[PDB]
């Protein structure tokens, strides 16, 4: 959570950091506001499980339970209301870099940053987050297939390995990650309690 900036320094580094923070805030606000024989097939809906998962997430306090159950390990198994078992995964880190280093010093009168690599690191992280939020913005909330930004290679491999299926299916699907990525889906989900969560839908080959 970021609220406002008060320091009015002259050095260019402060100006760059303030501009990047403003871009971050604008992206967060935008994402907040975003909240032959062919006629014998059927019009059955494509994305339905993700809608149910998001609706369960929108219920009272489930996101708080998920956040409180993922404080020590980045990967765990959490159970929602009613009955369901869904994998949860945490990516990136913004609860330590921006809340412990930049916020306590910007909210002052005479801020000054005597370094240059922090700008590069902050711009890289903000570029990643802004790319994610822009790709959600352009496609009106539904994207297909999932780009490299939402799911990296290592994370996808870990998710496939942790998927509760047999061994032959894992062997067949881990060698053709392009195809399984092509047929997946992504749904942008509830925003609240300073935590952003969305749903990724991966196919489960059966035959």
């Amino acid at each position, epitope marked *: 959570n970021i609220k406002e900036n008060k320091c009015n320094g002259t050095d260019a580094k402060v100006k760059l950091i303030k501009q990047e923070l403003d871009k971050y805030k604008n992206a967060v606000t935008e994402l907040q506001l975003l909240m032959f024989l062919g006629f014998l097939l059927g019009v059955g809906s494509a994305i339905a499980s993700g809608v149910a998962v998001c609706k369960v997430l929108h219920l009272e306090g489930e996101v708080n339970k998920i956040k409180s159950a993922l404080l020590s390990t980045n990967k765990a198994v959490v159970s929602l209301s009613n009955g369901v078992s869904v994998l949860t995964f945490k990516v990136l880190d913004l609860k330590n870099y921006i809340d412990k*280093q930049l916020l306590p010093i910007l909210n002052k*009168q*005479s*801020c*000054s*940053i005597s370094n240059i690599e922090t700008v590069i690191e902050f711009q890289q992280k903000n570029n990643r987050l802004l790319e994610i939020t822009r790709e959600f913005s352009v496609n009106a909330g539904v994207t297909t297939p999932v780009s490299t930004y939402m799911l990296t290679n290592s994370e996808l491999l870990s998710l496939i390995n942790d998927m509760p299926i047999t061994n032959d299916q894992k062997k067949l699907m881990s060698n053709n990650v392009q195809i399984v990525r092509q047929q997946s889906y992504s749904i942008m989900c509830i925003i609240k309690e300073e935590v952003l969560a969305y749903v990724v839908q991966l196919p489960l080959y059966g035959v």
Partner: antibody
Amino acid sequence: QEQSVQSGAEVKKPGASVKVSCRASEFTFSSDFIHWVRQVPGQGLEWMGRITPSDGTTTYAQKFQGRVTMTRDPSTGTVYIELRRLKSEDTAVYYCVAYDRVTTSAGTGATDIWGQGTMVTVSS
Amino acid sequence: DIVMTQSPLSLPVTPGEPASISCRSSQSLLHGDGYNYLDWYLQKPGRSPQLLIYLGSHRASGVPDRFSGSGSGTDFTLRISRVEAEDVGIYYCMQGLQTPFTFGPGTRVDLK
């Protein structure tokens, strides 16, 4: 950066007690310390003491130990300082200042605001 | 406590030439994690003191781009890039490491 926030001038007599009040709600900036600085005309500055507005922890100097008392009134967030037995030589000017500084891995923040200052004199 | 000295105790200045004032300290003022804890204060005749330099070699709001600080350890220098006719007054040297805070005697700067 004078903010023009203090009490008025004070004229007293030896053997009595003097009271100086500074209100810390018009500094326009949040502060973590309210250090008091005294200055006798014709000389330099000299530290007097400090109190934390959050709780009221007091820290004085060795020379002024056992004579000055600082208190905080949370009705308007004001600080009061009491001096006892002004055995002359205390004719000076008192300032209440906001003084905070924080350091991190990359970047330092500071906030320093001085006050208008009051004049306290003792005479027969 | 900690005892401070300044040099010189009198320094007339010309409107267009630079100037430098040195603060010399007792046992090192250098903190741990980083950065010094010394400050340079300015005072015009009659008004209230205004901060000039904080934490060694940084600048606060205002203070147009002709004041600078330098030094590491026990000696520090305040340098004026190009003085003007509005810098007459008294300069003070302050510490922030322990809390027997002790201002310096004060250097007087007047127009020549």
